Enzyme design. Structure first.
Site, PDB file in Angstrom:
ATOM      1  N   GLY B  46       0.850  -1.166   0.000  1.00 38.41           N
ATOM      2  CA  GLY B  46       0.000   0.000   0.000  1.00 38.41           C
ATOM      3  C   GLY B  46       0.882   1.210   0.000  1.00 38.41           C
ATOM      4  CD  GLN B  51       3.540   5.691   2.924  1.00 40.86           C
ATOM      5  OE1 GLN B  51       2.556   5.137   2.488  1.00 40.86           O
ATOM      6  NE2 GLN B  51       4.644   5.006   3.303  1.00 40.86           N
ATOM      7  CB  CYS B  97       5.334   2.021   7.380  1.00 45.78           C
ATOM      8  SG  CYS B  97       4.846   3.514   6.659  1.00 45.78           S
ATOM      9  CG  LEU B  98       6.905   1.035   1.414  1.00 43.10           C
ATOM     10  CD1 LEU B  98       6.213   1.291   0.074  1.00 43.10           C
ATOM     11  CD2 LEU B  98       7.971  -0.070   1.305  1.00 43.10           C
ATOM     12  CG  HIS B 139      -0.580   0.953   7.193  1.00 41.81           C
ATOM     13  ND1 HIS B 139       0.431   0.432   7.974  1.00 41.81           N
ATOM     14  CD2 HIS B 139       0.028   1.775   6.286  1.00 41.81           C
ATOM     15  CE1 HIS B 139       1.600   0.949   7.571  1.00 41.81           C
ATOM     16  NE2 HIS B 139       1.384   1.744   6.528  1.00 41.81           N
ATOM     17  CD  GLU B 140      -0.833   2.631   2.823  1.00 42.95           C
ATOM     18  OE1 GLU B 140      -0.389   3.794   2.766  1.00 42.95           O
ATOM     19  OE2 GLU B 140      -0.103   1.653   3.100  1.00 42.95           O
ATOM     20  CG  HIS B 143       0.425   6.828   5.630  1.00 47.99           C
ATOM     21  ND1 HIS B 143       1.559   7.104   6.355  1.00 47.99           N
ATOM     22  CD2 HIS B 143       0.565   5.548   5.171  1.00 47.99           C
ATOM     23  CE1 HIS B 143       2.354   6.025   6.365  1.00 47.99           C
ATOM     24  NE2 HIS B 143       1.784   5.071   5.633  1.00 47.99           N
TER      25      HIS B 143
HETATM   26  C1  56E Z   1       9.657  -3.857   1.280  1.00 50.34           C
HETATM   27  C2  56E Z   1       8.217  -4.288   1.560  1.00 50.34           C
HETATM   28  O1  56E Z   1       7.813  -3.463   2.660  1.00 50.34           O
HETATM   29  C3  56E Z   1       6.458  -3.341   3.167  1.00 50.34           C
HETATM   30  O2  56E Z   1       5.540  -3.472   2.341  1.00 50.34           O
HETATM   31  C4  56E Z   1       6.213  -3.078   4.642  1.00 50.34           C
HETATM   32  N1  56E Z   1       4.766  -2.975   4.906  1.00 50.34           N
HETATM   33  C5  56E Z   1       3.974  -1.990   4.406  1.00 50.34           C
HETATM   34  O3  56E Z   1       4.444  -1.033   3.788  1.00 50.34           O
HETATM   35  C6  56E Z   1       2.475  -1.971   4.661  1.00 50.34           C
HETATM   36  C7  56E Z   1       1.650  -0.972   4.074  1.00 50.34           C
HETATM   37  S1  56E Z   1       0.034  -1.239   4.613  1.00 50.34           S
HETATM   38  C8  56E Z   1       0.450  -2.577   5.630  1.00 50.34           C
HETATM   39  C9  56E Z   1      -0.527  -3.394   6.424  1.00 50.34           C
HETATM   40  C10 56E Z   1       1.782  -2.891   5.524  1.00 50.34           C
END
Ligand code: 56E
Ligand code: 56E
Ligand code: NA
Ligand code: NA
Lengths: 169, 169
Positions: B46, B51, B97-98, B139-140, B143
């Site tokens: 997401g 962001q 979260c990125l 979660h989004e 933000h």
């Molecule tokens: C490199 C991969 O990293 C990711 O995706 C880390 N998780 C997210 O960003 C995420 C956004 S909504 C949610 C429930 C998780």
């Protein structure tokens, strides 16, 4: 010898450490020397034994000279630390942690404490401390009871990466 | 075009974003395409417009295929999202979260929601969602109101670096 510092997520940082029982020993002295060496290489201001995966009530801290407002804190190795606030007064300030690289947050701490314990040669230490000196010892003490600074943040706007934050405390 | 993702500590992630008012426009479509491209390059599930430092109520999300238990979530771009729980039931689950690279924590979310808003061409979207699908949209949505997951952690034992954690949810 420089020891690896373990990172947040390692369960070994979440333990309640037992007391040091080898005061005055060659083995404690070697451990303490490693700790000071480890803290120094990482440019820390405090380091607790559980951060090198050593389950003991032991921390080192102190520096002459990055925390600009902070005066000198004597280089100190403290085993079996106990801490007591000397007033109810809390003060906010920036903290990072070598087990949480890249980040920092504003954390409230008691402004004024006494701490007591033992130097590695077994003689007693007891000092009243305030401001940054006090904060450092409270932060390291948390490590000995399995606590890290994020569970103490009240204002999440102040938590972020050190190269990005522009929060003006 | 791939956009830089801003990191926690950037005040632009702490804003309450205004609504999208250019539904159906070439400019929104380009922004959305950048978002999907940006999310994809980062391997996200997401991504919210703040962001990439775009102050708007807009998110993209979805994937076929790292979240093993998660079924497919349709690729979706949602402007002006509104969310309502469909039950009181909370469920715990892993989030990263990125804008907070390297870390993750267990976070409670509503298991069952409805969400409503608009696709970038201006047609309405409204869906009931559950489990990971629901979590991603909550979660989004955070933000868009200047909130990140750490201010939602209840159990700080589960917060740590992705390569170190051995918490068994
Ligand atoms: C490199 C991969 O990293 C990711 O995706 C880390 N998780 C997210 O960003 C995420 C956004 S909504 C949610 C429930 C998780
Ligand atoms: C690379 C330099 O990093 C740091 O020193 C980050 N801060 C600490 O580790 C710290 C320990 S006690 C306290 C009040 C702060
Ligand atoms: Na614990
Ligand atoms: Na805010």
């Amino acid at each position: 010898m420089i020891r690896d510092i373990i990172r947040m997520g390692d369960k070994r940082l979440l333990r309640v450490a037992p007391q040091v029982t080898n005061l005055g020993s060659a083995e404690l002295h070697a451990l303490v020397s490693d700790m000071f060496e480890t803290m120094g290489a990482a440019h820390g201001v405090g380091l607790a034994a559980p951060q090198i995966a050593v389950d003991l009530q032991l921390m080192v801290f102190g520096f002459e000279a990055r925390y600009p407002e902070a005066p000198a804190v004597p280089l100190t190795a403290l085993a079996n630390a106990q801490i007591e606030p000397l007033s109810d007064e809390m003060e906010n300030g920036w903290e990072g942690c070598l087990s949480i690289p890249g980040l920092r947050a504003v954390i409230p701490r008691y402004r004024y404490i006494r701490y007591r314990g033992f130097a590695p040669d077994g003689s007693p230490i007891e000092r009243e401390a305030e401001g940054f000196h006090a904060r450092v010892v409270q932060h390291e003490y948390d490590h000995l009871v399995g606590r890290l600074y994020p569970s103490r943040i009240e204002n999440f706007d102040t938590f972020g990466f050190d190269d990005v934050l522009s929060y003006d405390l």
